[PDB]
Write an enzyme that holds these catalytic residues in place. Structure first.
Site, PDB file in Angstrom:
ATOM      1  CG  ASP A 144     -12.042  11.035 -11.288  1.00  7.27           C
ATOM      2  OD1 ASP A 144     -11.481  12.135 -11.407  1.00  7.27           O
ATOM      3  OD2 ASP A 144     -11.966  10.324 -10.274  1.00  7.27           O
ATOM      4  NE  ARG A 148      -7.993  12.257  -9.217  1.00  9.85           N
ATOM      5  CZ  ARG A 148      -8.213  13.477  -9.680  1.00  9.85           C
ATOM      6  NH1 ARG A 148      -7.265  14.395  -9.677  1.00  9.85           N
ATOM      7  NH2 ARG A 148      -9.410  13.782 -10.167  1.00  9.85           N
ATOM      8  CG  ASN A 149      -8.189   8.503 -11.668  1.00  5.00           C
ATOM      9  OD1 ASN A 149      -7.807   7.909 -10.670  1.00  5.00           O
ATOM     10  ND2 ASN A 149      -9.178   9.393 -11.643  1.00  5.00           N
ATOM     11  CG  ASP A 162     -10.629   6.056  -9.933  1.00  7.02           C
ATOM     12  OD1 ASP A 162     -11.792   5.678  -9.648  1.00  7.02           O
ATOM     13  OD2 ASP A 162      -9.938   6.782  -9.175  1.00  7.02           O
TER      14      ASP A 162
END
Ligand code: M0R
Length: 304
Positions: A144, A148-149, A162
């Site tokens: 992932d 955003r992470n 994350d």
């Protein structure tokens, strides 16, 4: 050991007394992230923390996922990876981690785009490549990686977080085979879309999309394209477009992460070298117009 090395990471169980929530940072359906202050009892330190809590313990599947995440976060240690400080078991499972005050990098680049120069962008690219390379050393596939992470400790210092999809490959394994569940399609290697095969080289593809997010100051990849249509357009040869500020030197690094043959994509250790060379003369590779708190200890300096 007939295979892997014993994981002797320590899992710290923290008393609820030891920390105080301050503000909600964000709420999902499965819980909330708070910012807070952790104050180990015998120590004269206050440590800023994010506290990630499962909304309602009434979901054994959920409690199982957040503890999987904590296992992974507790077992990593690297300046560009977020590590677990401890867990709190009170009624709702809570993960405690070092507060990253500037938030996630995606919102950062969108909010500060008019003040982000080539030096920062290429340095972030180096630091994410370092974090990912370290996860590759630890035999860990993220699954992932995305802007955003990545979290922002300071504008000069980012870390990968994350670990909710992260899987540990064995000593005799090279690929992970998953089975359902929502996945970030627009960051996934084609092999992950077609065969649900994940590799460090699959993570390199995600790294390519994440660089593209940064170079576009937080643009959505394949914006307006149905996720179902992504498999076919990627087979036909289509890739994310060359961002305006990107020289061919940089955009070609991104394109190589999106080669169909996963082994002819770059290694994270090579991405470190290439962006590090570029970060040494940033304006040659990106073209960007205009280029009580007394006992507070950051977590990177609290080491027990
Ligand atoms: C200033 O805003 C924030 C600072 C944080 N500093 C540390 N950790 C955070 C933080 C979250 C923040 O805003 C919430 C929005 O985040 C965007 C998505 O986040 C991905 C994953 O993030 C996590 C994964 C596991 C854990 Cl245990 C904790 C976090 N969250």
């Amino acid at each position: 050991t007939s295979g892997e090395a014993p994981n002797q990471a320590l899992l710290r169980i923290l008393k609820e007394t030891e920390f105080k929530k301050i503000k909600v940072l964000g709420s999902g359906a499965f819980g909330t992230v708070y910012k807070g202050l952790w104050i180990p009892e015998g120590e004269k330190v206050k440590i800023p923390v994010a506290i990630k809590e499962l909304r309602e313990a009434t979901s054994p599947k959920a409690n199982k996922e957040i503890l999987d995440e904590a296992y992974v976060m507790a077992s990593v240690d690297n300046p560009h990876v977020c590590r677990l400080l401890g867990i709190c078991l009170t009624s709702t499972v809570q993960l405690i981690t070092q507060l990253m005050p500037f938030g996630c990098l995606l919102d950062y680049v969108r909010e500060h785009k008019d003040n982000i120069g080539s030096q920062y962008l290429l340095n972030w690219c180096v630091q994410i490549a370092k974090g990912m390379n370290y996860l590759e050393d630890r035999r860990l596939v993220h699954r992932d990686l995305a802007a955003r992470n990545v979290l922002v400790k300071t504008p000069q210092h980012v870390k990968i977080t994350d670990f909710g999809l992260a899987k540990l490959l064995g000593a005799e394994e090279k690929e992970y085979h998953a089975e359902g569940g929502k996945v970030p399609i627009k960051w996934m290697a084609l092999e992950s879309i077609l065969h649900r095969i994940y590799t460090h080289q699959s993570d390199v593809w995600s790294y390519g999309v994440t660089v593209w997010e940064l170079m576009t100051f937080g643009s959505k990849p394949y914006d307006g394209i149905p996720a179902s249509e992504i498999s076919s357009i990627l087979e036909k040869g289509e890739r994310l477009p060359q961002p305006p500020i990107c020289t061919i030197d940089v955009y070609m690094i991104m394109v190589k992460c999106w080669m169909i043959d996963a082994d002819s994509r770059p290694k994270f250790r090579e991405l470190i070298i290439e962006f590090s060379k570029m970060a040494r003369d940033p304006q040659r590779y990106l073209v960007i117009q205009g280029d009580d708190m007394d006992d507070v200890v950051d977590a990177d300096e609290y080491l027990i």
